[PDB]
């Protein structure tokens, strides 16, 4: 089945919503959905009927990932626990998911991937800055399709963005250089340990980013300057990044393909922040460095053949 039909069934309350928290379940029930506890949903039996999985407790993220290639149901998920599991993020996140024009987003995403596959480089203009993303001959993408294949899981945000990833190597697909003034950032952690080591500092950066004057600069694919709230914080980030994963190397670049209806303000850690236009550049893998995306919501994009 198609992503477009999935989003249509979701807006029509035509599928169950699997939830791992009773308070979140009550919020989802108030929006008109049938809710099923996470431990109670039959993920095994083959089924053509889809479901949305909302994961608000970090303790269930390993179980969510374990559904990969095992689930009998077409699924998307909203893994709030990896970002910020609070109820306000659930309410706002669901408002955004139910408001976005997903058909237009899927068309823009298709066109963007074809551009990313046919370009030597991409220029991202944000204020006075220009970030250049040089794309290689073999382009790695997390997901360029429009369908939900059996056993695969997808974040609800996946079909609203077009992204290329340095999956195999530090620059197996692209490398970046230049400056990106940005509106805000988000950060994804796949474990409680990681979120505890990094969250205090990143939430402080998040707080300070609301005062604008945010800039990330890349040299030879690696951050060499980070400014948040007009304050250089490069050494803070480098201190925790030291010796982990690929340090401050760019791991992902992408374009937000959706409208901005009910989009949330920067300064909260919403997994939907990349989708509402512009472009973003990311570091980390979410394993020993959070996957951090610096987002320029109003950036303009030029593809170079």
Numbering used by the authors: 17 to 321
The authors write:
Crocagins (1 and 2)24 are very small, intriguing RiPPs that possess a tetracyclic ring system, which consists of a pyrroloindoline fused to a tetrahydropyrimidinone moiety. Here we use in vitro experiments to demonstrate that three proteins, CgnB, CgnC and CgnE, are sufficient for the production of the hallmark tetracyclic crocagin core from the precursor peptide CgnA. We further show that the hydrolase CgnD liberates the crocagin core scaffold, which is subsequently N-methylated by CgnL. The crystal structures of the homologues CgnB and CgnE reveal them to be the founding members of a peptide-binding protein family and allow us to rationalize their distinct functions.
First, the structure of CgnE was determined to 2.0 Å. In CgnE, the metal binding site of Zn2+ 1 was disrupted by mutations in two metal-coordinating residues (CgnB numbering), Glu274Lys and His280Tyr, and no density for metal ions was observed in the CgnE structure. As expected for homologous proteins, the Cα root-mean-square deviation (r.m.s.d.) between the structures of CgnB and CgnE was only 1.2 Å over 284 residues. The aminopeptidases form an extensive dimer interface, and the residues involved in its formation are largely missing in CgnB and CgnE, which rationalizes their monomeric state in the crystals. The leader peptide is enriched with positively charged amino acids, and both CgnB and CgnE show a large, strongly negatively charged patch near the possible binding site. We found the binding of CgnE to the CgnALP to be almost 300 times weaker than binding to CgnA (KD = 514 µM). The main driver for binding thus appears to be the core peptide, and it is tempting to suggest that CgnE’s role may be to recruit the substrate peptide to CgnC and present the core peptide in a particular way that enables or accelerates correctly timed catalysis. CgnE appears to recruit the substrate peptide CgnA to CgnC and assist in catalysis, perhaps by presenting the core peptide in a specific conformation or by ensuring appropriate timing of the hydroxylation reactions, but does not seem to possess catalytic activity itself.
